[PDB]
Amino acid sequence: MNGTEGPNFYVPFSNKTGVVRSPFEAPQYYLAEPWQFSMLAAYMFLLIMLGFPINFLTLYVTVQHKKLRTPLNYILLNLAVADLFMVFGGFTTTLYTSLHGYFVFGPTGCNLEGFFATLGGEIALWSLVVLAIERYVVVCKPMSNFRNHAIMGVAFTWVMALACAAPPLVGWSRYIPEGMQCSCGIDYYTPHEETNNESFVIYMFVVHFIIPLIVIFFCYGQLVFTVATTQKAEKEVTRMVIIMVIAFLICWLPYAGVAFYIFTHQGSDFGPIFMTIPAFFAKTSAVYNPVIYIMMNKQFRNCMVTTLCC
Amino acid sequence: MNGTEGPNFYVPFSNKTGVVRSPFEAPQYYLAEPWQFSMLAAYMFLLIMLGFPINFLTLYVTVQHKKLRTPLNYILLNLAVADLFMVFGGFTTTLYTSLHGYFVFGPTGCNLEGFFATLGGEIALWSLVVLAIERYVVVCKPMSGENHAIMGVAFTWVMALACAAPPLVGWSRYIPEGMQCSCGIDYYTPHEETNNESFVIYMFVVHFIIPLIVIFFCYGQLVFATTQKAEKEVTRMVIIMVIAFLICWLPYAGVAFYIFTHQGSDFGPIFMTIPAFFAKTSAVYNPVIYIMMNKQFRNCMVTTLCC
Amino acid sequence: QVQLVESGGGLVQPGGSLRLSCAASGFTFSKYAMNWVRQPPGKGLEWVSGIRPSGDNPTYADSVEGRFTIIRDNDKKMVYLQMTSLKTEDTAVYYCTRGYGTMTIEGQGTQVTV
Amino acid sequence: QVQLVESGGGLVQPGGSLRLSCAASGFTFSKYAMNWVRQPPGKGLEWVSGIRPSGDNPTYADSVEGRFTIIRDNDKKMVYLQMTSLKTEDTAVYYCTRGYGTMTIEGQGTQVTV
Ligand SMILES: *[C@@H]1O[C@H](CO)[C@@H](O[C@@H]2O[C@H](CO)[C@@H](O[C@@H]3O[C@H](CO[C@H]4O[C@H](CO)[C@@H](O)[C@H](O)[C@@H]4O)[C@@H](O)[C@H](O[C@H]4O[C@H](CO)[C@@H](O)[C@H](O)[C@@H]4O[C@@H]4O[C@H](CO)[C@@H](O)[C@H](O)[C@H]4NC(C)=O)[C@@H]3O)[C@H](O)[C@H]2NC(C)=O)[C@H](O)[C@H]1NC(C)=O
Ligand SMILES: *[C@@H]1O[C@H](CO)[C@@H](O[C@@H]2O[C@H](CO)[C@@H](O[C@@H]3O[C@H](CO[C@H]4O[C@H](CO)[C@@H](O)[C@H](O)[C@@H]4O)[C@@H](O)[C@H](O[C@H]4O[C@H](CO)[C@@H](O)[C@H](O)[C@@H]4O)[C@@H]3O)[C@H](O)[C@H]2NC(C)=O)[C@H](O)[C@H]1NC(C)=O
Ligand SMILES: *[C@@H]1O[C@H](CO)[C@@H](O[C@@H]2O[C@H](CO)[C@@H](O[C@@H]3O[C@H](CO)[C@@H](O)[C@H](O)[C@@H]3O)[C@H](O)[C@H]2NC(C)=O)[C@H](O)[C@H]1NC(C)=O
Ligand SMILES: *[C@@H]1O[C@H](CO)[C@@H](O[C@@H]2O[C@H](CO)[C@@H](O)[C@H](O)[C@H]2NC(C)=O)[C@H](O)[C@H]1NC(C)=O
């Protein structure tokens, strides 16, 4: 066989040799070199290391100031929350798993890793859907005198993200160790028809990928003929919405591509490095988002220093 | 049978019940409540969490700027280095050990925890000896810059390794303290063959009393324009740096003496562990002062951050 | 509700032949793969053979390389293992597992005593 | 170079008496404490008794509470265990350990067969 399927897991490595074992039992050092597992932990450490401070500052500064109550700030606080949920919920588990080289926590340990990895991306995705719609309403001016509405659109992101991330935990689809058996994600590997994860992958790529991206570029297409001082501040922040997407596309496409590749070519010959590289790469979502919010948005940066330098 | 001594370890808990085990084998949840071990990890996490960013920024900003080459900045960069050695060398080990509830790494794992804990304090101590002498030379003007500072910064590492290295050499030793999560010098067992009894004298003499004398000896000299205002605030920060160091390290140093005096007495695991973990704030508080009080630095920090 | 039958097998001559069966029920059969795994009286399970869902490429262990052969019927939902030129060590209880794994549904299999 | 002698002990009457000895050599004796620990033929070591360096407060297990008694000589470097009103289960190999622990330095021991 090419890969080795089990009840809980699927190891992308042939069990002709006899070496293959469950990643919920023993370490998976036969997959890749043991130093590469340490390299994961090294990488995954820095995500946790720069995760909390940047997100917690972004969380604190926004709430501390009675100002900063624009739709942009609500969403980018929502991300700062979700990014901390990623760090403490997900990254912790995968950083520990990288040390041991397997999910020593267990199948439930895998769920945590995959859950907040799925939330993080979906809450980032559905937030870019909100940001896409929000600038269409103000710039193109379809609906007049229509700017608490923001908090409703921020609750939208969590409603849709849990529509994606929760069902695996419910038992429709499932989180399963990916690549080096250190991260977790949706089962693209086994058909798992009883679990029905085949149908979920359609549901996910349709409802939680294609529809979002349509709405984004549908809104982006409106401002092709389009592109006072507040509009300059609008422009830079509307430009940041583009850069926020550009980053999101660079981040999540590779993983999403490989996820489709495996779903199409189930049972094919692919190693543990195939999926793990773009998977761990996509966990930069926790850190890059606020760095833009500081970097580009001048209004925030000023207030950040105010909080730091009291 | 108040405490339970072993080859590697000493557990501050009677083995009348039969429950006591090595902290290099099994978890020590019989000592304290298992949630208290999680509370350690929680506390110890935040030391690592605020450790790297504050120290790395302080390290980066100082080196990045071609300015900031005053003796103050050399020492407070030296601390920023040692504080990162604490975080990555020591705190990592004790944060992991707090999870499992015992030194799963092993006796060598204990050495790492105790080594950088000893360096951190000694490099902070001997740095305050340097700062004490440095302001005496400028203010009181007994003897009428850059190279001299780097020599006095190398002094701190020479003396700190005189304290921290010998345990690893095998004179004295690092041994799990309190909840068996941190490590430090053996104040508990006589272990005459290791000769840790004599080390404790050596340590409290050479690596505590002599430093503190030199500090207050210099402080005693200063009992009786604008550049001097900048001198004053930075010389005031030297006082605040000591004030913090005294608040930090006295409790641990006191309990260390108490146990050394009253070896084999009745004392629980919380006795030593509280002031021990409290003294690991040395990594974080030092630079916070260097930012807080020193205006000259703060400005340059924002320059680096806000490019 | 899954149900794998384990028909075919019994007492056979040393160096004889035997055709095994595995009637699958209660899942989309053609949508995934099936294997054969045996239980030697002494040591742990040996992965005998395997085959893809389409059935294009079969895979065999070195132990039974060329002697055994695997083939499946998607329409009838069956998996066969034509065993030829048998040996004493081939004596085991044969199970037909799903996916690509040694995880055996049901039990009993078929005691092929050589 | 440490050397703990394990003198005293042997064959004794059920409900008899016996005085044990432990001549210490090769360390600051009064600077350390000393214990007594026995090896039952079947189960693991039992911590019998212990005493402080000064010798002020001796400590005994519930097993031998009142029957046994411990005392040490700092000048001669010796530790004694006066065992009285013995039992069948007191049959064991007795070791005198250092510190406060059941860690026994290699010793002749003393097979006290009751
Ligand atoms: C990748 O591929 C490898 C290939 O080896 C595979 O490893 C094997 O995994 C299987 C699990 O499916 C293991 O099978 C079990 O082995 C048990 C014994 O294993 C130990 O002991 C043997 C010696 O006996 C050693 O050689 C070995 O190293 C182990 O230390 C065995 O007991 C199991 O079989 C019993 O239990 C099952 C389940 O209940 C039962 O169905 C069987 O009938 C059997 O019970 C028997 O019952 C009778 C009646 O009551 C009783 O009298 C008899 O004593 C029992 N039989 C025995 C043998 O005692 C089971 O076969 C297998 O050992 C692994 N191989 C190795 C090398 O150990 C990996 O799992 C694959 N990786 C993945 C995750 O895909
Ligand atoms: C705190 O106090 C407890 C009190 O029990 C100590 O626990 C005992 O530690 C001793 C240390 O030597 C153990 O002694 C050894 O036991 C072995 C067998 O133990 C297992 O098997 C028995 C049944 O046979 C079970 O009842 C038991 O639970 C264990 O699973 C023996 O094989 C050993 O004998 C060998 O070594 C000795 C060394 O002196 C030789 O003299 C012998 O000839 C032989 O080679 C040995 O006797 C004892 O088993 C432990 N008891 C328990 C709880 O199981 C703790 O160690 C102590 N803690 C600290 C930190 O000091
Ligand atoms: C492990 O995965 C590899 C792919 O990574 C599988 O190889 C594939 O095997 C099938 C069946 O033999 C090939 O399909 C056939 O290809 C030929 C030539 O292109 C074509 O004429 C036939 O009509 C048919 O489509 C497939 O091409 C091949 N893939 C490649 C490019 O190597 C392999 O079977 C897997 N191993 C097992 C047994 O799981
Ligand atoms: C455990 O330590 C306690 C002290 O913390 C010891 O108690 C002392 O015992 C001496 C006699 O040996 C008395 O003179 C003291 O007054 C006691 N101290 C107090 C105030 O409790 C105790 O003996 C120790 N246990 C052993 C057996 O070593």
The values of phi and psi at residue B234, to 5°, are -80, -30
Looking at residue A223, its amino acid is L
Angle made by CA atoms C18, C22, C26, in degrees to the nearest 5: 175
Ligand 3 atom nearest to A3, measured from its CA: 39
Looking at residue B200, its amino acid is V
Number of structural domains in chain B: 1
Could you tell me which of D101, B119, C35 has the C-alpha nearest to residue A4?
C35
| CA of D24 relative to ligand 2 center, distance in Å | 24
Looking at residue B294, its amino acid is N
**C63 is written with which tokens?**
């132990």
Q: Which residues of B171-209 are buried (b: 16+ CB within 10 A; e: fewer)?
A: ebbbbbbbbbbbbbbbbbbbbeebbbbebbebbbeebbe
Among the partner residues D33, D61, D101, nearest to B264 by beta-carbon distance:
D33
Instruction: Round to whole Å and give the CA distance between A189 and A184.
Output: 12
Instruction: Round to whole Å and give the CA distance between C39 and A93.
Output: 37
How many Cα atoms occupy the beta-carbon half-sphere of D36 within 13 Å? 31
How many CB atoms sit inside 10 A of residue B7's CB? 11
Instruction: Round to whole Å and give the CA distance between B108 and B167.
Output: 11
Number of DSSP helices (H) and strands (E) in chain D, helices first: 0, 10
Give the largest CA-CA distance in chain D: 38
Q: How far is CA D14 from the centre of its chain?
A: 19
Residue B20 near ligand 2, beta carbon < 6 Å: yes
B5:D2 CB<8 A: no
Instruction: Round to whole Å and give the CA distance between A75 and A127.
Output: 6
How many Cα atoms occupy the beta-carbon half-sphere of A191 within 13 Å? 16
Residue D41 near ligand 2, beta carbon < 6 Å: no
Angle made by CA atoms B152, B155, B160, in degrees to the nearest 5: 140
Instruction: Round to whole Å and give the CA distance between B188 and B178.
Output: 11
Structural domain for B270, as ranges: 1-307
C72 - beta bridge partners? C79
Least distant ligand from the CA of B24:
2
Q: In degrees to the nearest 10, what's the CA dihedral of A88, A91, A93, A96?
A: -120
Residue B14 near ligand 4, beta carbon < 6 Å: no
Resolution attained, angstroms: 3.7
DSSP C16: -
Domain D3-112 has CATH 3.40.50.800: no
What technique solved it? X-ray
Among the partner residues A49, A301, A305, nearest to B52 by beta-carbon distance:
A49
Q: Which residues of A121-141 are buried (b: 16+ CB within 10 A; e: fewer)?
A: bbbbbbbbbbbbbbbbbebee
Pairing of strands C111-112, D3-4: unpaired
D48 contacts D110 by C-beta, under 8 angstroms? no
- Which of D100, D102, D105, D106 is best to mutate for the B interface (most B CBs within 10 A)? D100
Q: What is the 3-state secondary structure (H, E, C) of chain A?
A: CCCEECCCCEECCCCCCCCCCCCCCCCCCCCCCHHHHHHHHHHHHHHHHCHHHHHHHHHHHHHHCCCCCCHHHHHHHHHHHHHHHHHHHHHHHHHHHHHHCCCCCCHHHHHHHHHHHHHHHHHHHHHHHHHHHHHHHHHCCCCCCCCCHHHHHHHHHHHHHHHHHHHHHHCCCCEEEECCCCEEEECCCCCCCCCCHHHHHHHHHHHHHHHHHHHHHHHHCHHHCCCCHHHHHHHHHHHHHHHHHHHHHHHHHHHHHHHHHHHHCCCCCCCCHHHHHHHHHHHHHHHHHHHHHHHCCHHHHHHHHHHHCC
| CA of D65 relative to ligand 4 center, distance in Å | 19
User: Could you tell me if B150 lies within 8 Å of chain A, comparing CB atoms?
Assistant: no
Pairing of strands C92-95, C111-112: antiparallel
B200 contacts B112 by C-beta, under 8 angstroms? no
D100:B193 CB<8 A: no
Looking at residue B178, its amino acid is G
Residues 6+ apart with CB under 8 A from B10: B3, B4, B175, B176, B186, B188, B189, D100
Residues 6+ apart with CB under 8 A from B20: B4, B11, B13, B14, B30
D98 - beta bridge partners? D34
Pairing of strands A183-186, D46-51: unpaired
